[PDB]
Design a protein around this ligand. Sequence first.
Ligand code: HEM
Length: 147
Amino acid sequence: ERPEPELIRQSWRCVSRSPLEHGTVLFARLFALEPDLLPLFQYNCRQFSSPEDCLSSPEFLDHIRKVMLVIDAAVTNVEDLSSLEEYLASLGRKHRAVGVKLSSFSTVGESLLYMLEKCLGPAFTPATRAAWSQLYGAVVQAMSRGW
Ligand code: HEM
């Protein structure tokens, strides 16, 4: 289904002003659901590979901001995601090459919905949750070409 654009745009405003705070919620959920992702971050951390320091490092914070900016790109292009097909395919290839499993992107989708739910509370309606599931599903499909 094409995600209902107004529901995507309005609900995104909840997180989009403070993207590091909200992206940090997403990542907390990601580690709660798939804690085995930590080593992949640790081994890619250049400044500090120990757990706490890697997770608080500029590289890791930068990556939280990158995740939120890619979702913002999908929100702002929700009516025509063809404008991100090559970017997303290449993004998938890049993750595959640093050892990420395609299946971990399902965990990310769960974490994104969790983040939104926490920000919006009862404004995160079933229609709005569905629209997000559809938008994220289209992003992962475009990325999945990289595996
Ligand atoms: C599933 C968990 C994820 C892991 C373990 C992960 C890990 C990484 C790693 C290690 C890099 C560095 C790649 C390199 O040096 O070539 C990277 C880059 C990046 N990641 Fe992720 N990532 C994840 C999910 C995501 C998601 C969901 C997005 C956005 C939807 C995203 C956006 C990016 C971007 C934009 C870059 C920069 C790519 C570039 O340099 O061209 N990541 N990620």
